[PDB]
Ligand binder design. Structure first.
Ligand code: GX4
Ligand code: GX4
Lengths: 412, 412
């Protein structure tokens, strides 16, 4: 048998704000965080907009000297991680430090640091490569730097499962706690891919919306005029905690993480199967894991990337798993507002799934002006919908056909 | 409840050979795979050598058309994965595809591809970035492409924990099986960081041996004249199987994986503690997890990177964990011969640890001419040592204070 896992701390950088409550405010108001990218010549690029983190002050978290050593994606992860730990009220001690671990991931990692260090390599030669290039860029340095700053001696690792990173990180952090390997984990993901390599790289695959004239309308999941995902930066971190540990210190419990599902499509490198067979298996795995019937699910935070084939696979998958319950659950894409934070998408959308539970409100899918063929589910078009939510799912579907599902329940 | 996990398949590319048996023959003969690098011009670099994979033919495994789109670290990962699965005799069917997953990781991932595409972006512009840049370079696409080629629909993920990646990948994959999330897992890691950014980045940090004039003598773990690690390329993959599943199909069992430890040092971004504290916590977690008396340990495959601080930390950790039994077990570093395969180090060394059990021989630490102050254990200097090995331990340490231990024993 198995220990129960609750959420006692949440932290976030998003295109909607510098913390969870500002972000959540934007979500329920249907605000877009998408805009032309600044301080950067995108003249030769077919996409010139995305979700940037606006006004981020790393010196709230690190000295200028330590921040200079770390890629933006690491700064973002640390910000969310430090917010999440502070939000939890947890005190690290000699008595508990070996029971507190970290799993903060990234899908794409340190492109900004790779670009600057390439610029030096090609222009001047290898002698201008930063000494901090490697430890300042490697994906596991959010877990590493967090563990060093706070003295965490529990499981220390990082997932990289592309657009599924955040979902997987949180789920496998929850298994560490459930199976007694840890009492507390900081888990989630961070990403800064709004640079030339990210816009360029995704641009070259024609994966990105090129709607440069109306950036706020670019991300339009399940809408017949969608033309690919919007690329976005940020981080999400949760403090996961064994229930008895949380109750003993009198922790505030936002929700219970009751279920985690993983699956592989074994289909295509970037395209999901049309019927979403992988996403269906993954969601069924998560519900079986939670001991729940599909009928008990009230809210789904969709992957909902605004890609032609991705959005319609998730409709198929939901209809397949949920049968005659499929129209009764509400399902929304907060990527309609935030765009796609890649590896951090699962982390911030777990937070939105938890806050949907706390506030009894389904976040909207904005821009859903003209649902596409078969997109006839309750996709919460345009406006937030207050409703009953006991159980919320969060899905992520990534490149290589890697799937993640998290199941959260109201706690009382 | 918690199930037992055995090794039924292994695969490898190393600087010593294009498979396991060829690589193992090199190990037992004390051969170095380190040589001046030929595939690029390093006259600007303070390190001009490493452990290259020599004569690798990707068209033994994949079509030239798909090979061309993948970073060498993905090619190496798939080659080792394919060997391991063939070596297992396992047949993937509709009855078991959902119960077979893959966790093949990398420390640095697609550095070559990112460099070349970064060169295209700066010299030419974003219209010259490869459409395959992202799916051909990101760390999770070994697990991704393996699942697509073999039809594996089980848990599909990747770790990135720097020089610990391979040990963590194998360990967490065993936990998947132990806890019933899968019956089979292909796990390990791959690395190809020998490009300008790689040798330049580690060179900027002064982390690498600069013994350019005698590369086969550069990697000299615990030797007083060591001057940093030797960068090497390749792949290790293992087929992990639930015991009863392996028994049921009459699989050949190399060994049982009885123990896994993880621990963060929470010490420093890149330097390990002098006293071996994080390593010690990790090995103790691993030994308790295996339900072992530490005097049961016969053979330790050390991290053994040929850094001043790393090498002596490990002696301290082993003396602290094993007390007087530290003087009875044999410890060696195959990095004396392979060099440091970073995220793939834990995977090839897990295979060497298993083969030490099959053949009852401790691999040598070559180039240990003048052991350093306090390096007074049986380090298997110069020559392989036939000896009783019931229990073998494999240690990895990484940047971020991230530690891993695997415990294998002979299976009757
Ligand atoms: O984003 C990508 C691929 C699309 C290109 N990368 C994968 C490997 N990771 C990496 C880590 C450390 C380092 F030194 C360099 C690269 C993250 C960057
Ligand atoms: O000169 C410095 C400042 C500490 C003073 N370095 C920063 C990068 N560090 C590092 C070590 C190994 C390595 F492979 C990569 C990076 C340590 C060296």
């Amino acid at each position: 048998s198995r220990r129960r896992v609750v959420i006692t701390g949440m932290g976030m950088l998003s295109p909607l704000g510098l913390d969870v409550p500002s972000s959540w405010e934007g979500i329920l108001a249907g605000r877009s965080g998408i805009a032309p990218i600044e301080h950067m010549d995108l003249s030769a690029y077919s996409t010139r907009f995305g979700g940037s983190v606006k006004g981020f002050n790393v010196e709230e978290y690190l000295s200028a000297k330590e921040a200079r050593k770390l890629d933006l994606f690491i700064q973002y992860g640390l910000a969310a991680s430090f917010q999440a730990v502070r939000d939890s009220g947890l005190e690290v001690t000699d008595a508990n430090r070996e029971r507190i671990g970290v799993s903060m991931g990234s899908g794409i990692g340190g492109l900004t640091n790779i670009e600057n260090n390439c610029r030096s390599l090609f222009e001047q030669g290898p002698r201008r490569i930063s000494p901090f290039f490697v430890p300042g860029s490697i994906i596991n340095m959010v877990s590493g730097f967090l563990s060093i700053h706070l003295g965490l001696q529990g499981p220390n690792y990082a997932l990289t499962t592309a657009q599924t990173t955040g979902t997987h990180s949180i789920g496998m952090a929850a298994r560490n706690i459930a199976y007694g390997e840890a009492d507390v984990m900081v888990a989630g993901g961070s990403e800064m891919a709004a640079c030339g390599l990210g816009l360029g790289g995704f641009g070259a695959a024609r994966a990105l919306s090129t709607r440069n004239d109306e950036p706020t309308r670019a991300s339009r999941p399940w809408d017949r005029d969608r033309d690919g995902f919007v690329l976005s930066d940020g981080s999400g971190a949760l403090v996961l905690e064994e229930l008895e540990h949380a109750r003993a210190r009198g922790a505030r419990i936002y929700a219970e993480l009751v279920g985690f599902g993983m699956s592989g499509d074994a289909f295509h490198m970037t395209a999901p199967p049309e019927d979403g067979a992988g996403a269906a298996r993954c969601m069924k795995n998560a519900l079986r894991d939670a001991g729940l019937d599909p009928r008990q699910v009230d809210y789904i935070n969709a992957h909902g990337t605004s890609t032609p084939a991705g959005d319609i696979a998730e409709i198929a998958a939901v209809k397949s798993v949920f049968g005659e319950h499929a129209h009764a659950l509400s399902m929304s894409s907060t990527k309609s507002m935030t765009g796609h934070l890649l590896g951090a998408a699962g982390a911030v959308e777990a937070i939105f799934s938890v806050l949907a539970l706390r506030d009894q409100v389904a976040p909207p899918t904005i821009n859903l002006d003209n649902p596409d063929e078969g997109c006839d589910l309750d996709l919460v078009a345009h406006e937030a919908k207050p409703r009953k939510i006991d159980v919320a799912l969060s899905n992520s579907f990534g490149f290589g056909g890697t799937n993640g599902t998290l199941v959260f329940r109201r706690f009382a």
